């Protein structure tokens, strides 16, 4: 219950730090450090989430096979939507690094705003998807 959501909160904190567009995050965006750090954070989040889901399934009662299969599939589909949005965020951060490499070192002051709006919409949809993942987990604790 708590551990995977605590990992998700650490991921949120890192996402806020990267969407502040500080000069530290602007020099780490070109060293690919933020990309792999975000990757490790969301990987820990996903591992905790799937561990919680596997424990919930492990303590599933006198369940019919098809219903258990469908519930597990619901949780897995929620998690994989989260993974899809996460991977899109990661790939677009890499693309932003390689397309500020298009002038080889310097970035403008408006491509930052465009990237920032993209990151804000990504954060909102990530919150929505993570909370429906938690909802699917709650639904799993039944039957």
């Amino acid at each position, epitope marked *: 219950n708590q551990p995977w959501e605590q990992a998700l909160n650490r991921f949120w904190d890192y996402l806020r730090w990267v969407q502040t567009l500080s000069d530290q995050v602007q020099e780490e965006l070109q060293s690919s450090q933020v990309t792999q750090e975000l*990757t490790a954070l969301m990987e820990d989040t*996903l*591992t905790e989430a*799937i*561990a919680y889901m*596997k424990e919930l399934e492990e303590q599933l009662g006198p369940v019919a096979e098809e219903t258990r*299969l469908k519930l*597990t*599939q619901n949780v*897995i*589909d929620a*998690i*994989t939507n989260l*993974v*899809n949005d*996460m*991977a899109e965020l*990661r*790939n677009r951060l890499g693309q932003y690094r390689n397309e500020v490499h298009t002038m080889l070192g310097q970035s403008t002051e408006e491509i930052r705003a465009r990237l920032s709006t993209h990151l804000r919409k990504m954060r909102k949809r990530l919150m929505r998807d993570a909370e429906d993942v938690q909802k699917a987990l709650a639904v799993y604790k039944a039957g």
Partner: antibody
Amino acid sequence: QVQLVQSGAEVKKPGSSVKVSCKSSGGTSNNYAISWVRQAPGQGLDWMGGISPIFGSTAYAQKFQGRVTISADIFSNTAYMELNSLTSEDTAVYFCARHGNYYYYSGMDVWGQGTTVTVSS
Amino acid sequence: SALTQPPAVSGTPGQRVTISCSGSDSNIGRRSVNWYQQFPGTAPKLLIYSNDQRPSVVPDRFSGSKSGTSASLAISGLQSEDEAEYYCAAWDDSLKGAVFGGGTQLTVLG
């Protein structure tokens, strides 16, 4: 219109290892189980193993467990099979196939084009 | 190779033919059987799952059945396009893994 696309053909010497990849184009296959099935020239299908990464399950066939390693990168929507200690007996065609659900019981309804692996001295 | 199929099966156009698939108490006795079709030089295609279900693209000329330790595929209205190899597959708990049959080479006379 999700499609599994595999890496190109491989020609190896006995004793080396091979790594075949399987990329999902037009969609994600993370919520499904991807299994690797090999077919020797003129022989039948042979299950090597499989992986569903979101469910966190990598299973191997008992024949290949000591040699094969199956993994997946979920952020690039790719699966990988690495076969070690290649001999002449391993020349075959390797397909990656996607099951109907997150586990390996269901039928494999989406198939890649296959990777030809030729091991010869 | 825990499942057994007849290696060769023939039939005239229009005829109805069957492919048998006998297993054990650990692969077909407790798990469902799938049927795949493979043409020369191409990837296999899922033809039957859960012993009797057809994918939407598979015509109703193909049917499946399962009885205890055995399974059976039935191809009615045999056409020349059906010359292929047919594999039955299941999950073996004794082996803890997927098992296939030897493959049946369906040839059409004429």
